[PDB]
Design a protein around this ligand. Structure first.
Ligand SMILES: [K+]
Ligand SMILES: [K+]
Ligand SMILES: [K+]
Ligand SMILES: [K+]
Ligand SMILES: [K+]
Ligand SMILES: [K+]
Ligand SMILES: [K+]
Ligand SMILES: [K+]
Ligand SMILES: [K+]
Ligand SMILES: [K+]
Ligand SMILES: [K+]
Ligand SMILES: [K+]
Ligand SMILES: [K+]
Ligand SMILES: [K+]
Ligand SMILES: [K+]
Ligand SMILES: [K+]
Ligand SMILES: [K+]
Ligand SMILES: [K+]
Ligand SMILES: [K+]
Ligand SMILES: [K+]
Ligand SMILES: [K+]
Ligand SMILES: [K+]
Ligand SMILES: [K+]
Ligand SMILES: [K+]
Ligand SMILES: [K+]
Ligand SMILES: [K+]
Ligand SMILES: [K+]
Ligand SMILES: [K+]
Ligand SMILES: [K+]
Ligand SMILES: [K+]
Ligand SMILES: [K+]
Ligand SMILES: [K+]
Ligand SMILES: [K+]
Ligand SMILES: [K+]
Ligand SMILES: [K+]
Ligand SMILES: [K+]
Ligand SMILES: [K+]
Ligand SMILES: [K+]
Ligand SMILES: [K+]
Ligand SMILES: [K+]
Ligand SMILES: [K+]
Ligand SMILES: [K+]
Ligand SMILES: [K+]
Ligand SMILES: [K+]
Ligand SMILES: [K+]
Ligand SMILES: [K+]
Ligand SMILES: [K+]
Ligand SMILES: [K+]
Ligand SMILES: [K+]
Ligand SMILES: [K+]
Ligand SMILES: [K+]
Ligand SMILES: [K+]
Ligand SMILES: [K+]
Ligand SMILES: [K+]
Ligand SMILES: [K+]
Ligand SMILES: [K+]
Ligand SMILES: [K+]
Ligand SMILES: [K+]
Ligand SMILES: [K+]
Ligand SMILES: [K+]
Ligand SMILES: [K+]
Ligand SMILES: [K+]
Ligand SMILES: [K+]
Ligand SMILES: [K+]
Ligand SMILES: [K+]
Ligand SMILES: [K+]
Ligand SMILES: [K+]
Ligand SMILES: [Mg+2]
Ligand SMILES: [Mg+2]
Ligand SMILES: [Mg+2]
Ligand SMILES: [Mg+2]
Ligand SMILES: [Mg+2]
Ligand SMILES: [Mg+2]
Ligand SMILES: [Mg+2]
Ligand SMILES: [Mg+2]
Ligand SMILES: [Mg+2]
Ligand SMILES: [Mg+2]
Ligand SMILES: [Mg+2]
Ligand SMILES: [Mg+2]
Ligand SMILES: [Mg+2]
Ligand SMILES: [Mg+2]
Lengths: 55, 24, 101, 161, 97
RNA sequence: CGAAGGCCGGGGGCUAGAAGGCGAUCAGACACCACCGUAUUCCCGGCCGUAAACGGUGCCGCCCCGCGGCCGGCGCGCGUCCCGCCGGCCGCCCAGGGAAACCGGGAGGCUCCGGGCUCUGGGGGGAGUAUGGCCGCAAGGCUGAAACUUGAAGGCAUUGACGGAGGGGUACACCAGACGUGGAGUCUGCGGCUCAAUCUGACCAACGCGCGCACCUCACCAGGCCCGCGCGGUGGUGCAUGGCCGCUCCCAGCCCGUGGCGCGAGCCGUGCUCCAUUGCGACAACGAGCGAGACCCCGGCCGCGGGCCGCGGGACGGCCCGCAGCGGGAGGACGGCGGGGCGAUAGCAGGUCUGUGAUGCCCUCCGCCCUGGGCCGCACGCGCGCUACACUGGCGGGGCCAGCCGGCGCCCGCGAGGACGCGAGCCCCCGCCGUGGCCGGGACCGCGGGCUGGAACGCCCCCGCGCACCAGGAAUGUCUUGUAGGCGCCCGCCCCCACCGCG
C-alpha cells in the first residue's frame, strides 16, 4: 500500500556527490531525499510515511 | 633515542656491572 | 555571468556625468549617444561601444531612484526664524559658584 | 511515471522530429513518448544513428500488438511505461525514492534493453521481441525484463531502509 | 619552542594544584581548569515531534521537561570534533563567545 | 617537611588496573582497539628524597605613565550605592629594556656600567660515565674525572615547500550514463635476441614521435675510385652555448614610484560577488603598469554596391517580474554569442649541436663518389591503432543526396590496366540465405595476369586455399549539440604504396 505525496519545495543537494535532493512534500511537512531531477509540485510514490530524512 | 629510555638503558648497564664485579 | 571590467565602468561614469541631459534611460538613444565624436568619445570598436552603452543606460535609471548639487548647496544655508535654544542639581552648584545665581 | 511527464498530444504522423529536446533541463518532459522509445532503440553502438530504421522497427511492432491484444498500441505503450521503473532506490546505503522523469527514463531504457538482449543471436526478430516486451511489461508479468529489474531494485531498496 | 600563551594554556591563578576530570569522549585525565566546558539545556523529546507528544497528552497544562548537561572535553577531542578551532595569532587573543 | 611510583611489617579489598592471558588487525604486531585479570590503588607504623617539584624567572629594600576586574579589612560622603586607604590575586599598556619572542607589580631605573646576601655556568661529545667516599633493606640518591674525538651544536625570527591539519572555491575529476581499450588475428613503434651491419635520439611531459627506408635518403657494413666494375666531416660534447619547442600552466598570477613599519632577512600596497587579482565595498597606504579582458579568424540573420565576394547593420545581462550581481519569463536568426589564434613575471643541468654557411672547445684528415647489403632480420614482453565475433546481419539488383574543391571522351581488356584525343558511403526499395564457426570472419599459402622503375624485394587484379576468433580476468581511458558513435572523402610525405597524421 504505497501513498502519493506532493513536493512542496526543494531544500538542496544532500550527498557528497550531488545525487539526491532534500525536499518538503505534503496534512504533513515530511522531509525526504530523492534521487532524480525534481521540480516543484511533483508527485512521489512513498512506500511509507514513517521514515523522515535526517537534518 | 628518547632520553628517558637512554637513562633506563644506562641504569640496567650499571646494575649489570655491579653484579659482575660482585663476583671476586 | 557578464561582469563589466573597470574599463567599461570608468568610461561610463564620465559619459553619464558629462552628458546627463542627453541620455534618456532607454537604450537605443544611448547607443547613438556613445557614437558621436562631438560628445567626444573615441570608442575603437562597436562591441566595446555596446557594452559601454549597456552600462550607461543602467547608470541612468539609478540616479532617478548638476541638479542634485545645486539644491544640496541651496539647502545648506537656510537659517530659520527660530533659534533652536529659546532641571539641574549639580550644575546649579556651578552657576552659583560662577556668577549671579 | 505521471501524467505530467508522459506527453500524449505532441505526437506527429511519424516519430521523426529533428527536435533539440535536450538543450535545457526539463524540456524533454514535453518530448513525445514514442519518439523517446525510438531514440532509446538505436542504442547498440553498431546501430548509432540509423533512426530511419528504428522508426520502421517500432512501426511494425504496432501491427503485432493490435493483432494480439486487439487494442490501441499507444495505450499499451503508456501502460508499459507506467508499470516499469523503480519507485524506490538505494544510494552506508540508505533508501530513497525516485522522481517521475527518472522513472520514465529507466522504464523506457529497460524495455529497449530487454528486447535488445532477447534478440541477440536468435532467429526471432528484434521487432517481435519488442512486441513481447511491451505486451508483457504492461500487464505485470514476471517474464518481463523491466519488471524483474524493477523488483530487484525495490528489494535492494527494502533491505537498505 | 618559545611561550605560546600568557596563561600557559590553562586558567590557574594563585594555587599549586587543582582537581582531575575525565574527558567525556575518550576518558583521559585532564586538570579541571584546562578542560573545555560547555553547558547545554535541551528538550527530552526532539523538536520534530514536540507537538505530537503534546497533542497526545492527557494531562491538562503539561510542559515538556528539559535536560541539563555540562559537557567537558580534552583539547584533542575538542579540536577533532570542532568544539574549538585553531585560530590565527591575532585571533587567539579574543575571548568573545 | 616533601606529588606519584617504589620498599619493610600489619589490615582491608568495591573500582580501575603495571605483569600475565586471550579476540582482532597487520607482511609481521610480542603495540595501538575488545575482553579477563596479579601487584598497586585505601588504612596504620616506618623507609626512600626524586618530577616539565615551572612563573623553566633565588631572597630582602627604594623609585616607577596610566586604564580596568575580583577578594579581605577600614574610613568619609550623600539617599543599597559612591569616593578613597591598606594588603592580596589578575588583565591591558605610554616610556624604558631586549637578538627577538616578548617584559612592563620588571625582564625598567645598566658600556651614562658599584644597595646587601647566597647559589650556578663558561663550544659540542665522551658523561653524569669510570673511580673513591657518605647515605639507603633494596631500587637509588648526593658528590664526580681523564684519555680521546669533533667544526660546529643552539636561540629567536623571515620566505618557500610540505602536512593521513582546519576553512573557502573548482575541472568530464567524480556522480547519471554512453563509447571503449585490456582477450583473437593484424599494421606500426619500443625493449630484448641475432647479426659483417641490423646506424642513432627520447623511458604525466619516451613508445603511428624526430612528414611514405628497393637506389637515393644514409648517419651503418663488404669492397673499390679521386683530391666487383687550411678546406671540409650529420664525428663527439644539449652538463660548454644561441634559437626554437615542451613542461610547471592555460594556472590567475606578477610587479613599480612616493609614503609607513622593522637592527635586518622582510612586510604593507597586493567580507559580498564573477569563468577569472572579474568587480563592489572597506582599509597606512596613495597612485600606475603587465597578465585577464579588450583584440584577430571563422560561422549563423539583415541591408547598399558589384558580378556568389566585399562593404556595413545586428546583442547590450537591453525589456518585464522576484530578491557589484544570482533567478524566472518574453521577443529575436542567435541569450548572456559559439569554435579557434595570441599568450605575463620566474624557472627545468627535460629535447634538439644529426635542419642550416648558428656555434666554442675536443678529434679526423670520419671528406666526395660507385657497386652490393643492412636499418624490414625474431623463442619473447609492452604503447597507439585496424578488422571482427553476425539476423539492429551478410549477399544480388535497382534509387538517390555532400563538403574540404575538382578534367574526361573513344576504343581494347573479366579485371587490374593499356593504345589513341578534346575541355561518396551509410540509407531507401525489391529479393535470397535461416542460428549451422553457415553464405559470419579473411589471416596464411599455390598457379597466373599487370603497373612503377636502371633495377621488386613494392603495389594491383583473377581463380583456389578458408586461421584465430561466441563480446573478452586483474586492471584501465575519453566524452555534454549537430556533440558521442556510425559512414565514407580529400591533402601531406610520395618511382610505387596508409591500417598514419592534418582536415
Ligand atoms: K631529562
Ligand atoms: K629524560
Ligand atoms: K626517568
Ligand atoms: K627551542
Ligand atoms: K621553552
Ligand atoms: K597547559
Ligand atoms: K585559585
Ligand atoms: K584552585
Ligand atoms: K572552557
Ligand atoms: K589532550
Ligand atoms: K614525605
Ligand atoms: K613521594
Ligand atoms: K608500592
Ligand atoms: K581490590
Ligand atoms: K580497600
Ligand atoms: K605500577
Ligand atoms: K595485554
Ligand atoms: K610494541
Ligand atoms: K607501536
Ligand atoms: K576486567
Ligand atoms: K608494586
Ligand atoms: K592491595
Ligand atoms: K594512584
Ligand atoms: K584501595
Ligand atoms: K615517598
Ligand atoms: K630539569
Ligand atoms: K609549568
Ligand atoms: K638563593
Ligand atoms: K570584594
Ligand atoms: K573588597
Ligand atoms: K581573602
Ligand atoms: K570584602
Ligand atoms: K571589602
Ligand atoms: K576593597
Ligand atoms: K594599596
Ligand atoms: K597592595
Ligand atoms: K590594591
Ligand atoms: K601581585
Ligand atoms: K641560597
Ligand atoms: K643555583
Ligand atoms: K643550580
Ligand atoms: K648546576
Ligand atoms: K666505582
Ligand atoms: K645499606
Ligand atoms: K641487604
Ligand atoms: K626489598
Ligand atoms: K645494594
Ligand atoms: K647498591
Ligand atoms: K652509588
Ligand atoms: K638552532
Ligand atoms: K638548546
Ligand atoms: K634543539
Ligand atoms: K632547547
Ligand atoms: K628577530
Ligand atoms: K635566526
Ligand atoms: K606521439
Ligand atoms: K606611522
Ligand atoms: K629601514
Ligand atoms: K599596515
Ligand atoms: K593592510
Ligand atoms: K606585498
Ligand atoms: K596581506
Ligand atoms: K588593505
Ligand atoms: K566588389
Ligand atoms: K569584389
Ligand atoms: K546597447
Ligand atoms: K640546432
Ligand atoms: Mg621523612
Ligand atoms: Mg574490576
Ligand atoms: Mg576486574
Ligand atoms: Mg633534580
Ligand atoms: Mg624543578
Ligand atoms: Mg628548576
Ligand atoms: Mg582575583
Ligand atoms: Mg585571580
Ligand atoms: Mg597581573
Ligand atoms: Mg659560577
Ligand atoms: Mg661507586
Ligand atoms: Mg662509591
Ligand atoms: Mg632573526
Ligand atoms: Mg640504402
Amino acid at each position: 500500500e504505497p501513498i502519493n505525496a506532493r513536493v512542496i519545495e526543494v531544500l538542496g543537494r544532500t550527498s557528497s556527490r550531488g545525487g539526491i535532493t532534500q525536499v518538503k512534500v505534503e496534512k504533513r511537512q515530511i522531509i525526504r531525499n530523492v534521487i532524480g531531477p525534481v521540480r516543484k509540485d511533483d508527485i512521489l510514490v512513498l512506500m511509507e510515511s514513517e521514515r523522515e530524512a535526517r537534518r | 633515542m628518547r632520553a628517558k629510555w637512554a637513562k633506563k638503558r644506562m641504569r640496567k648497564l650499571k646494575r649489570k656491572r655491579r653484579h659482575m664485579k660482585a663476583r671476586s | 555571468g557578464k561582469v563589466r571590467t573597470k574599463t567599461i565602468k570608468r568610461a561610463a561614469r564620465k559619459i553619464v556625468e558629462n552628458n546627463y541631459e542627453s541620455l534618456k534611460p532607454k537604450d537605443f538613444q544611448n547607443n547613438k549617444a556613445i557614437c558621436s565624436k562631438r560628445n567626444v568619445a573615441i570608442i575603437p570598436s562597436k562591441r566595446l561601444r555596446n557594452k559601454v552603452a549597456g552600462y550607461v543606460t543602467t547608470l541612468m535609471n539609478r540616479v532617478v531612484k548638476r541638479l542634485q548639487e545645486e539644491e544640496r548647496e541651496r539647502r545648506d544655508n537656510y537659517a530659520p526664524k527660530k533659534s533652536e535654544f529659546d532641571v539641574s542639581g549639580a550644575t546649579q552648584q556651578m552657576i552659583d559658584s560662577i556668577g549671579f545665581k | 511515471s505521471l501524467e505530467a511527464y508522459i506527453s500524449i498530444d505532441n505526437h506527429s504522423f511519424v516519430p521523426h522530429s529533428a527536435g533539440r529536446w535536450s538543450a535545457k533541463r526539463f524540456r524533454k518532459a514535453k518530448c513525445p513518448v514514442v519518439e523517446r522509445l525510438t531514440n532509446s532503440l538505436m542504442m547498440h553502438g553498431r546501430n548509432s544513428g540509423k533512426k530511419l530504421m528504428a522508426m520502421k522497427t517500432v512501426g511494425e511492432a504496432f501491427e503485432l500488438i493490435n493483432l494480439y491484444t486487439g487494442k490501441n498500441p499507444v495505450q499499451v505503450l503508456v501502460d508499459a511505461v507506467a508499470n516499469s521503473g523503480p519507485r524506490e532506490d538505494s544510494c552506508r546505503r540508505q533508501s530513497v525514492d525516485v522522481s517521475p522523469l527518472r522513472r520514465v527514463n529507466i522504464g523506457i531504457y529497460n524495455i529497449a534493453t530487454g528486447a535488445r538482449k532477447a534478440a541477440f543471436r536468435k532467429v526471432r526478430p528484434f521487432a517481435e521481441c519488442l512486441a513481447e516486451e511491451i505486451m508483457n511489461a504492461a500487464a505485470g508479468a514476471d517474464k518481463s525484463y523491466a519488471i524483474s529489474q524493477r523488483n530487484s531494485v525495490e528489494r535492494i531498496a527494502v533491505s537498505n531502509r | 619552542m618559545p611561550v605560546k600563551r600568557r596563561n600557559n594554556g590553562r586558567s590557574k591563578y594563585n594555587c599549586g594544584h587543582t582537581n582531575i576530570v575525565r574527558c567525556q569522549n575518550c576518558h583521559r585525565c585532564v586538570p579541571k581548569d584546562k578542560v573545555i566546558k560547555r553547558f547545554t539545556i535541551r528538550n527530552i523529546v526532539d523538536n520534530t515531534i514536540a507537538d505530537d507528544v503534546l497533542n497526545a497528552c492527557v494531562i491538562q497544562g503539561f510542559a515538556i521537561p528539559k535536560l541539563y548537561n555540562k559537557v567537558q572535553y580534552c583539547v584533542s577531542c575538542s579540536i577533532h570534533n570542532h568544539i574549538v578551532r585553531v585560530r590565527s595569532r591575532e585571533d587567539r587573543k579574543i575571548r568573545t563567545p
